[PDB]
C-alpha cells in the first residue's frame, strides 16, 4: 500500500509531519495510532521506538521537532544510512 | 454468540482510593483497580458497549487533575480523546502497546463486566499473563 520503505525515503520535514500527527493523535481511532507508531519504529531501526514518544527521558525535549532532532543524532552517532537527501 | 461485553448496560461501582502514580502499578499483582474519582462520574450511566465505557474512563483520567498528571502531551491528547495511554519498553509486547481494562473474575464463570470493582487497569504484559498467551 502507500507505505514507506524505511526512514531513508522520508526527507526530515515529512518524518516530522508523521511525528506531529502521532503526537497530537491526529486521526480517528486508536487502532490507527498503534499502527502509525509501529511504522515509525520498524523504519528507523531504533530499539525503544514507541516509548521515546510516549515516556520522555529526563534531559530530552519532548515535542515532534525535538524527537526528530533526537533521531537525527542517533542515526549519525551509530553510523546509519540517515534520511533521504534533504 | 458475541460475548456480552459488546452490548448496552449500566455501569456500577464504588472504586479504589488511588494516587497519581496508579499507571506504574498495572504490571503488579493482577493490575491496578479503577479509581473512585472515575467511578463516581459513571454511577449508573448507560453505556452502549465496553469500548464506549473505556472512552469515558480514559477521559475522566484527563478531567481529573491528579490522574493524567504523569502523562506527557501525546498521552494527554490521547486520554482527552477517550483512548488508552501507552506503556514503557518493558511493558509493550510487540503488537500490544496500549493500557487495557481486564477482570478479576473470568467472564464465562460469572464475571461482572460493567461493575468497576472488578476492572483492573493492566499493561499488555499483564493482560497476556492472566489470559495465558492470548
Burial (CB count <10 Å: 0-12, 13-18, 19+), residue B58: buried
One CATH from 1.10.4160.10, 1.10.1200.20, 3.40.50.2300, 3.40.50.300 for A1-86: 1.10.1200.20
- Please say whether the beta carbons of A41 and B92 come within 8 A: no
User: Any binding-site annotation on B102?
Assistant: yes
- How far away is chain A from the Cα of B75, in angstroms, using its nearest Cα? 7
Residues of chain B with C-beta less than 8 angstroms from the C-beta of A63:
73
Q: DSSP character for B119? A: E
Residues of chain A with C-beta less than 8 angstroms from the C-beta of B87:
51, 54
The residue assigned the cell 498528571 is B69
∠ Cα B127 B129 B133 (to 5°): 95
- The CA distance from B117 to B39, in Å, is 9
Burial (CB count <10 Å: 0-12, 13-18, 19+), residue B66: middle
Beta bridge partners of residue B47, listed in sequence order: B9
* Domain ranges within chain A, ordered by starting residue: 1-86
- The CA distance from B5 to A60, in Å, is 41
The residue assigned the cell 500527527 is A21
Give the domains, in start order, of chain B with CATH numbers: 1-134 (3.90.540.10)
Distances B9 to A41, B6, B15, B66 between C-alpha atoms, Å:
39, 9, 18, 28
B75 in reach of chain A (CB within 8 A): yes
Question: Which residue from B85, B106, B88, B83 is spatially nearest to B30, judged by alpha carbons?
Answer: B106
- The CA distance from B20 to B14, in Å, is 18
- The CA distance from A76 to B95, in Å, is 28
- The CA distance from A35 to A79, in Å, is 27
What nine digits make up the cell of B55?
A: 472512552
The residue assigned the cell 488508552 is B84
- The CA distance from B25 to A44, in Å, is 30
Choose the catalytic residue: B37, B54, B102, B120.
B102
- Please say whether the beta carbons of B7 and B51 come within 8 A: no
Amino acid at each position: 500500500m502507500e507505505l514507506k520503505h524505511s526512514i531513508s525515503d522520508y526527507t526530515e520535514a515529512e518524518f516530522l509531519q508523521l511525528v506531529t500527527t502521532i503526537c497530537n493523535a491526529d486521526t480517528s481511532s486508536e487502532e490507527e495510532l498503534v499502527k502509525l507508531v509501529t511504522h515509525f519504529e520498524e523504519m528507523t531501526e531504533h530499539p525503544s521506538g514507541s516509548d521515546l514518544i510516549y515516556y520522555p527521558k529526563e534531559g530530552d525535549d519532548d515535542s515532534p521537532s525535538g524527537i526528530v532532532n533526537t533521531v537525527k543524532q542517533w542515526r549519525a552517532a551509530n553510523g546509519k544510512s540517515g534520511f533521504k537527501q534533504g | 454468540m458475541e460475548s456480552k461485553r459488546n452490548k448496552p448496560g449500566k455501569a456500577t461501582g464504588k472504586g479504589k482510593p488511588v494516587g497519581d502514580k496508579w499507571l506504574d502499578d498495572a504490571g503488579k499483582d493482577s493490575g491496578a483497580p479503577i479509581p473512585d474519582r472515575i467511578a463516581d462520574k459513571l454511577r449508573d450511566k448507560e453505556f452502549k458497549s465496553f469500548d464506549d465505557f473505556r472512552k469515558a474512563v480514559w477521559e475522566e483520567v484527563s478531567k481529573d487533575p491528579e490522574l493524567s498528571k504523569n502523562l506527557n502531551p501525546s498521552n494527554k491528547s490521547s486520554v482527552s480523546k477517550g483512548y488508552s495511554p501507552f506503556t514503557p519498553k518493558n511493558q509493550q509486547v510487540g503488537g500490544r502497546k496500549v493500557y487495557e481494562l481486564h477482570h478479576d473474575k473470568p467472564i464465562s464463570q460469572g464475571g461482572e463486566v460493567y461493575d468497576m470493582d472488578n476492572i483492573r487497569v493492566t499493561t499488555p504484559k499483564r493482560h497476556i499473563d492472566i489470559h495465558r498467551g492470548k
